[PDB]
Structure 1
Amino acid sequence: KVFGRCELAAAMKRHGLDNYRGYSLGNWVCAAKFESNFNTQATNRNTDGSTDYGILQINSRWWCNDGRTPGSRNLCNIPCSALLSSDITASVNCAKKIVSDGNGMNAWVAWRNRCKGTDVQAWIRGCRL
């Protein structure tokens, strides 16, 4: 599914991401825009052979099992294909674990390089939430 901006903000809000670990909703919308262009079916291979999955590009090296990332972990205890669903629950629940692992949203390279230090509230401006 390709979400609209405000549609995704509302879904993320209902799933408890607004100010989760101190990250306002616009941070999560901004990260999703630049990780996946709001497309739940996004996939992208990494140089080390791992793959990133879904709206928040969660990587199989640590967080999910895809059966083809040797020596990896599965810390969210999910198949990576679950992260491609039109229902974002699994992506959101795994992201809560990632953002709590000590580095906050810096775990998402695109957030650090494209969202951190910008006016992220613009990403939710106009939305009925």
Structure 2
Amino acid sequence: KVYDRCELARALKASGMDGYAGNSLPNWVCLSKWESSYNTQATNRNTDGSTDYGIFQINSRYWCDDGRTPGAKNVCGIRCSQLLTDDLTVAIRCAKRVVLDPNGIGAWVAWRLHCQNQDLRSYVAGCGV
């Protein structure tokens, strides 16, 4: 599914992402936009044999099993395929796990690049949340 910006903002807010591990909602909408353009079906293969999956582009080297990644740890304990559904439940539960590591939201390259230190007001403007 390709989510609408406010539609995504509502589903994240409803799922307890606003303030999760100290990351306000606009952080999460900004990284989703830059990482996947809001598409739950987005996939991107890396040089290292790993692949990024879903709206949050979670990486297969550490977080999910895609059965073709060398040295994979599957910390979320899931199949990467579960990260591509229109339903965000599993993706959200795994992104919540990812942010608890030491690097926090800095785990996401797109956040570091386009959201960190930025004015993110625009990502939730007009959503009424």
Return the TM-score normalized by structure 1. Answer: 0.98
Secondary structure of the corresponding residue to residue 113 of structure 1? helix
SS in 1 for 2:41: coil
Q: Distance in 2 between matches of 1:110 and 1:70?
A: 24
Q: 1:120: how far off?
A: 1.1
Aligned to 2:97: 97
- Report how far residue 8 of structure 1 moved: 0.1
Cα deviations by residue, 1:39-60 (Å, 9 ceiling, x for unpaired): 0000000110000000000000
What is the Cα-based RMSD across aligned positions, in Å?
0.6
Deviation per residue, 1:25-68 (Å, 9 max, x gap): 00000000000000000000011000000000000000000010
**1:14 aligned onto 2:22:** no
**Identity across aligned pairs (percent)?**
60
Letter in 1 for 2:46: N
| Runs of 4+ in structure 1 over 3 Å off | none
Alignment match, 1:44:
44
Q: Does 1:75 align with 2:75?
A: yes
Q: In the TM superposition, what is the alpha-carbon distance from 1:128 to its structure 2 partner? A: 2.2
Give the distance between the partners of 2:47 and 2:108, measured in 1 at CA.
Answer: 16
What's 1:128 paired with? 128
Q: Is 2:85 the partner of 1:85?
A: yes
Mapped to 2, the partners of 1:71 and 1:122 lie a distance apart of 39
Secondary structure in structure 1 of the residue aligned to 2:44 = strand
2:62 counterpart residue number: 62
| Counterpart code for 1:55 | I
Aligned length: 129
Structure 2 counterpart of 1:34:
34
1:58-88 Cα deviation digits (max 9, x unpaired) = 0000000001002211000000000000001
2:3 is aligned to: 3
State the TM-score, normalizing by the size of structure 2: 0.98
